[PDB]
Amino acid sequence: NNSTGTAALAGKFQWGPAFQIKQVTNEVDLVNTFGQPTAETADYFMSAMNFLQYGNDLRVVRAVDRDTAKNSSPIAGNIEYTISTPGSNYAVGDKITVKYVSDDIETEGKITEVDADGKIKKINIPTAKIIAKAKEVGEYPTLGSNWTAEISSSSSGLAAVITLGKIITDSGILLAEIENAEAAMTAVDFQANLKKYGIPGVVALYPGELGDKIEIEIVSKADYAKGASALLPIYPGGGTRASTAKAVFGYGPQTDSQYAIIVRRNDAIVQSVVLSTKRGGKDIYDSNIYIDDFFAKGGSEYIFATAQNWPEGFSGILTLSGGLSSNAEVTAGDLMEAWDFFADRESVDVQLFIAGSCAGESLETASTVQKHVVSIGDVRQDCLVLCSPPRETVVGIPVTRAVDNLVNWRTAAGSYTDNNFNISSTYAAIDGNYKYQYDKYNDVNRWVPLAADIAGLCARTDNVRGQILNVIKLAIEQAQRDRLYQEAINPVTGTGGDGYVLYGDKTATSVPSPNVRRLFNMLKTNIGRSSKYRLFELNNAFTRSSFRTETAQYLQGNKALGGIYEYRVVCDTTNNTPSVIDRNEFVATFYIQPARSINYITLNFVATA
């Protein structure tokens, strides 16, 4: 696609998917998905955004702390409680009252499940009023001490003891990959509370406080006819609110195990569907509308649910809260776990690597992450890991100190002996100051890693250096320049106004000094893909031809278009075995010369056992 400028980016975002290679094409399409730049997200949003300016496709992976990220959920408003002593002879809508020091706060609680003897099995206390009072007096969500719960005075029956804990702030669920999808939705601990507080397993799809804005409305085939009158209750807050189901749906809930779901964010009816808790069941189109499956297959952009422990005939308003994406503390490693999603050509065809995106992070991590990212392109050698310097080193100080710093860092030397970037890959392109952009979102001028940009600037020019788009200032703008070149660092210089790329790129190594790389990288990548063909047929002398003819046609095309010159089909093609009667499997070895360079480079790719 000009050689398939597929970028690759991993970093912290305001919105999941977490640890998923979700692809992104638009700006307004990444905002939709990982959206606004927080002061902890900025350099990654930008990283993407100001790349999609030269960008076709970008593959991203959100780094979440797996230990403390949270998807908003319906659990996360309720209130700890343990039926210390089941009464006897109680019944079901016997009301419960929560007092603050012999003073009534909430009086709409109510026993909700007894057995044959009236033994209290389950209750439901609304927390709207109490968390209020509690916030109001420093006892949030601690609670416990002066907080007490008594029964109606009285229900038919006696003997009971309900004991109040704290306001649950742990949503109790985190969705990352889909291999684990509903397996987290079906964890004893999670599924436990879905029973305890008598609600369905419906959670926000992506870790993040942004999920708190979602509000599911559920109506069953039961309260659907009364769809207008039916006064849906609101969990866990409390109070009720006239249903809307029949006033939004034509095709109503069919079987008794089908439910109307209406998802809202900001009063907006973001999604409207009807699903069933019984496997097999379909709509009038034989579309499997069994909950677990529906969502199991990109069914919904917003939420995720599970038929498990879904209360029968449940109808009500679910209030998602406790949602919590924490970039707060995403450890450096938590980033490397993410990046790893790209470290195998078997799996993801990604041409470029946006890495400087960590420029801002803890100096340490600034270095050690990138350093590692290089060690992914290295071991795979189908890419370009392009990388940029740490803000510390380049933005604040004047150029005098500036360069000293950069060179120390590229070796060890002075201050950055420890957090050095002292590596040397022909795939390593480092990145040479740091850009000063404007942030249309927060509406502020901001420093961002320049690497993110040049990478898109590659998806462009040739296959995968011409002024950059939205810069408004660069950290720096002859001896040093020559020094930076040779160092194989990409500089930006400003002359007479307007800054331009000094040199074409790469942190090159043992190869001739020579754009030339992209030609070769592209050819090698394309040649290997043709390997699928090998499985198709057997290997013979003829197979030498055919494969040879196919690749040759590709190579010749490159020459005709221009890009490769002096390509001799005769002795620039493949024969794995030595020229002899004997032969072996074919490896594609080619000697190709980029148009502007009087040198032929030998590349060998092998398809063999």
Q: Select from 13, 483, 47 the least CA-distant residue to 207.
A: 13
- What are residue 70's phi and psi, to 5 degrees? -145, 135
Please, is 83 exposed, middle or buried when counting C-beta atoms within 10 Å of its C-beta (0-12, 13-18, 19+)? middle
Q: Cα–Cα distance between 259 and 221 in angstroms, integer?
A: 6
Q: Cα–Cα distance between 484 and 25 in angstroms, integer?
A: 34
Three-state SS for 139? coil
* Sheet strand arrangement including 385-386: 353-354, 385-386, 428-431, 489-490
- The enclosing H or E element of 292 equals helix 291-296
CB-CB contact of 451 with 354 (8 Å): yes
- Please report, for residues 107, 305, 330, 488, the alpha-carbon distance to residue 167 in angstroms, rounded to integers and kept in the order given: 17, 23, 26, 57
Beta bridge partners of 447: 436
Strands of 326-421 (E only): list them: 353-354, 385-386
Q: What is the DSSP letter of 245?
A: G
Helices 42-49 and 451-460 sit at what angle, rounded to 10 degrees? 10
Q: Cα–Cα distance between 69 and 325 in angstroms, integer?
A: 5
- Please report, for residues 312, 323, 564, the alpha-carbon distance to residue 316 in angstroms, rounded to integers and kept in the order given: 12, 20, 67
CB-CB contact of 411 with 9 (8 Å): no
Token reading at 296 = 């199991």
- What are residue 217's phi and psi, to 5 degrees? -115, 120
Q: Cα–Cα distance between 207 and 176 in angstroms, integer?
A: 8
Distant-in-sequence, close-in-space partners of 180: CB < 8 Å, separation ≥ 6: none
CB-CB contact of 488 with 72 (8 Å): no
Distant-in-sequence, close-in-space partners of 159: CB < 8 Å, separation ≥ 6: 85, 86, 87, 88, 89
Token reading at 300 = 């919904």
Please, is 272 exposed, middle or buried when counting C-beta atoms within 10 Å of its C-beta (0-12, 13-18, 19+)? middle
Please, is 343 exposed, middle or buried when counting C-beta atoms within 10 Å of its C-beta (0-12, 13-18, 19+)? middle
Q: Cα–Cα distance between 314 and 218 in angstroms, integer?
A: 7
- Please report, for residues 102, 291, 381, 527, 552, the alpha-carbon distance to residue 586 in angstroms, rounded to integers and kept in the order given: 87, 50, 20, 12, 14
Q: Select from 512, 467, 501, 504 the least CA-distant residue to 488.
A: 504
Sequential DSSP letters for 4-68? --EEEEEE--SS--BS---EE--SHHHHHHH-S--TTTHHHHHHHHTTTTT-SEEEEEE---TTT
- Please report, for residues 223, 241, 274, 354, 588, the alpha-carbon distance to residue 231 in angstroms, rounded to integers and kept in the order given: 9, 5, 19, 52, 71
Q: What is the DSSP letter of 160?
A: -
Q: Cα–Cα distance between 142 and 166 in angstroms, integer?
A: 5
Distance of CA 283 to the CA centre of its chain: 32
Where helices occur in 436-595 by DSSP H, the ranges are 451-460, 479-484, 516-529, 532-536, 541-561
Three-state SS for 376? helix
